[PDB]
Amino acid sequence: GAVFKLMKSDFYEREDMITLKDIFGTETLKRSILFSFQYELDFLLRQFHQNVENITIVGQKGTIMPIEARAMDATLAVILKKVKLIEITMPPFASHATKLIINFYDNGECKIFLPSNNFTSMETNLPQQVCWCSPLLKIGKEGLPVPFKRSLIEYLNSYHLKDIDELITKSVEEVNFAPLSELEFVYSTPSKFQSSGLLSFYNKLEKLSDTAKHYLCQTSSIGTSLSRARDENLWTHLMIPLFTGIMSPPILPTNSLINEYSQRKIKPYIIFPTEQEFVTSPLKWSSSGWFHFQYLQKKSYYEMLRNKFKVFYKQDPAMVTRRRGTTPAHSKFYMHCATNSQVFKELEWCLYTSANLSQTAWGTVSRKPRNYEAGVLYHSRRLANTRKVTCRTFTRDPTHVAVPFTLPVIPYDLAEDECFCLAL
Numbered sequence: 312g313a314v315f316k317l318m319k320s321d322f323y324e325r326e327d328m329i330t331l332k333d334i335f336g337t338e339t340l341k342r343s344i345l346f347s348f349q350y351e352l353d354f355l356l357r358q359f360h361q362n363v364e365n366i367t368i369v370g371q372k373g374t375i376m377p378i379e380a381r382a383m384d385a386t387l388a389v390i391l392k393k394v395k396l397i398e399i400t401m402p403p404f405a406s407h408a409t410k411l412i413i414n415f416y417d418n419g420e421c422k423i424f425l426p427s428n429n430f431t432s433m434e435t436n437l438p439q440q441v442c443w444c445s446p447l448l449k450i451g452k453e454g455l456p457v458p459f460k461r462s463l464i465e466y467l468n469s470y471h472l473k474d475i476d477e478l479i480t481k482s483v484e485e486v487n488f489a490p491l492s493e494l495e496f497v498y499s500t501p502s503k504f505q506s507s508g509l510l511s512f513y514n515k516l517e518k519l520s521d522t523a524k525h526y527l528c529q530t531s532s533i534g535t536s537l538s539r540a541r542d543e544n545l546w547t548h549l550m551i552p553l554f555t556g557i558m559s560p561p562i563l564p565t566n567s568l569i570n571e572y573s574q575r576k577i578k579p580y581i582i583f584p585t586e587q588e589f590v591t592s593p594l595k596w597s598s599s600g601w602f603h604f605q606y607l608q609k610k611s612y613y614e615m616l617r618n619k620f621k622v623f624y625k626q627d628p629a630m631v632t633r634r635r636g637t638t639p640a641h642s643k644f645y646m647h648c649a650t651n652s653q654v655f656k657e658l659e660w661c662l663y664t665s666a667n668l669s670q671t672a673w674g675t676v677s678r679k680p681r682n683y684e685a686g687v688l689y690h691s692r693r694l695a696n697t698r699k700v701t702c703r704t705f706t707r708d709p710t711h712v713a714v715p716f717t718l719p720v721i722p723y724d725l726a727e728d729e730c731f732c733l734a735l
Contacts, residue, residue, distance in 0.1 A: 419450035534669030
């Protein structure tokens with residue numbers, strides 16, 4: 312089956328888990344297709360076995376760092392000849408955030424991964440990272456159309472590039488995706504033909520058809536307000552309201568929402584590092600570079616999330632490992648849970664994705680997303696046997712999902728805790 316693994320780190324594991332060598336380093340690997348926001352070519356190509364025939368790399372123009380002559384050796388020069396680059400040109404303020412690997416092995420086997428890390432050395436080892444791993448797939452003629460496959464093909468087509476169509480989509484078309492029949496592939500694309508993002512994700516959740524209702528988000532970036540005039544958060548103001556049916560598609564004042572959440576017993580969570588959590592991290596402030604929440608210009612937005620929605624949660628400092636401490640995770644998870652502690656062990660659904668909590672990644676009801684984003688959805692109603700999505704934490708390390716934060720999470724202590732602000 313599909314499985315979540317924690318990325319090994321060159322700093323946290325000196326002496327389950329995965330590495331890029333595990334993924335690219337096997338001699339049965341014939342062809343590898345990559346999607347990332349950023350690539351350190353010499354770090355990446357050192358992960359491959361001599362036997363690989365083709366490495367196709369999709370990325371944003373100006374994000375692939377070439378190998379400099381002085382970094383070359385005999386070995387890299389051989390692997391380098393097998394690399395084909397597909398350059399995407401993006402609008403300003405848009406990112407090719409998607410992280411995706413599609414591997415082809417010797418016996419017509421095929422495996423798919425969503426790493427949360429871009430293919431750079433520091434990003435791989437500093438913040439905590441996870442990698443979702445598909446079940447093994449076979450090149451074979453296909454019967455039932457699989458939703459996961461269908462969505463992965465529309466996403467590939469939304470690039471509208473001839474090179475993707477020929478070098479990628481055609482190979483992916485030959486693969487039989489039956490083992491992924493329970494799961495969904497959810498994505499964002501700036502393409503104006505294909506719909507995506509929040510809009511399309513809402514429809515999917517509606518389509519899959521009393522108690523306390525928990526919605527949680529773990530993210531390395533948190534966008535600013537949706538509106539220049541009032542204070543409006545993507546998650547508290549638009550996403551959760553959509554999913555709970557508080558609003559329908561044809562935004563409410565903050566105060567109405569607070570009453571609605573109290574009356575419907577909605578509990579929102581955003582997990583994002585405190586100021587203090589870096590003090591208790593082994594590498595200290597080393598992984599802070601990746602966590603982005605600029606709230607110094609608009610203090611009332613932050614105060615609102617922190618004080619009125621009481622939205623912020625942090626690691627349980629008792630339950631984390633000594634080797635990883637309170638280092639934050641750069642993975643993104645969005646999840647929903649209904650309780651009639653053990654909260655988040657059984658889920659209505661869980662989305663694991665490269666989309667941050669921002670309008671750039673998701674769009675809104677009216678705006679299209681600006682980014683490319685990719686992810687996988689686990690929904691209760693699409694499960695074959697269980698009828699509930701199971702989740703566990705890597706910190707106690709056989710479930711559907713595994714998450715790199717602790718379970719439970721602990722509310723920010725309103726007397727002391729503050730979101731980490733990169734501006735300081």
